[PDB]
Design a protein around this ligand. Structure first.
Ligand SMILES: [Ca+2]
Ligand SMILES: [Ca+2]
Ligand SMILES: [Ca+2]
Ligand SMILES: [Ca+2]
Ligand SMILES: [Ca+2]
Lengths: 200, 202
């Protein structure tokens, strides 16, 4: 009987959580926009910030030649553009380079919050979250230069992340955690990581 | 470059916005937390059950068998943000009478204050080894031969030494602040989810 009540109260919490996120989005959207314009003026800001971010959340998924592509990353943006603020849109923008084709210099991936999937899950949302789905983002690599190719001897690539959908039965992955890390840690804290790299 | 100067300016805007956001969070959730607490107090052993169900590596690992005996009598846990700076956190443990705590130590309230200067020596340690909080020792009176926090040789490690932590020592090698933040930002807001999970696994 008290479990009933507890259940109802928890629904308001969930409701309040989404409202808070909505306010966050409205509040920080102009700031991120302002910050974006300055950061674009700072050469190699993003590859530096990525490298300085916690190893076990990011760099561990990044190979030397992955880093070579990422050295040409001139912009990183994260948006919460939809009615559900839990949807996250991540944008990578590269300058022309030896690895990517010009048609693939602007890479956008959308992660949608999936109520059905989130309810279905039993795992701790901070440990192994199971809530997001996405569509494949195609990348065309220049000849000889495809880092995501599935052949023997080829280093595992950061860039396979872009093909992730979250639609399989797979509680054993890191792609959703990476998305959340980029959205909720790397992007907001990017200047702090960059600043740390600079001190030595 | 001039660019790095602008970045510093913007960062300050972010920190202000982040504090403003938190104040909104406090006004929005405080009434919900009060209502929830009322209902939790009539669910027997809610808190020790939610604690046991919390991630092992965040809480359980610091709790000894004897610690768990004390925690079995935890009837209320509250977290507040009562100061002008919403980053200050006040954590309240309320126990029923038991064989460990003198009756004058059944209401244990620990205040963590956000330290501006401490935070900016450790700016990139945001979620891995935060170093931003300071606190006052919380005195606990234990019944005779029941002081789990004794520093006698051979004495098993105890969760309850957490209450004496201050964060004013030169010590970047700690778990006490991370425990504070886990309690304030994970255990307390997600307690029901933790309790529910424990109940589906019986
Ligand atoms: Ca997998
Ligand atoms: Ca995978
Ligand atoms: Ca994982
Ligand atoms: Ca220490
Ligand atoms: Ca630690």
């Amino acid at each position: 009987t008290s479990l009933d009540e507890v259940a109802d109260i928890e629904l308001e919490f969930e409701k309040a959580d989404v409202e808070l996120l909505k306010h966050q989005v409205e509040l920080f959207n102009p700031l991120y926009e302002k910050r974006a314009m300055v950061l674009r003026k700072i050469p190699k800001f993003w590859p530096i910030a990525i490298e300085a971010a916690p190893s076990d959340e990011l760099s561990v998924y990044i190979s030397p030649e992955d880093a070579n592509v990422l050295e040409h990353l001139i912009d990183l943006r994260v948006y919460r553009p939809n009615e559900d603020p839990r949807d996250i849109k991540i944008v990578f923008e590269f300058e022309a380079n030896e690895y990517l084709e010009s048609n693939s210099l602007y890479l956008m991936k959308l992660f949608r919050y999936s109520s059905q999937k989130a309810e279905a899950s039993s795992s701790n949302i901070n440990k192994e979250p199971s809530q997001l789905i996405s569509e494949k983002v195609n990348i065309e690599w220049k000849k000889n230069k495809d880092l995501t190719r599935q052949t023997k001897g080829t280093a595992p690539s950061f860039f396979t992340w872009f093909s992730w959908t979250g639609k399989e039965n797979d509680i054993f992955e890191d792609e959703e955690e990476l998305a959340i890390f980029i959205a909720e840690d790397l992007y907001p804290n990017a200047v702090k990581y960059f600043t740390d790299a600079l001190q030595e």
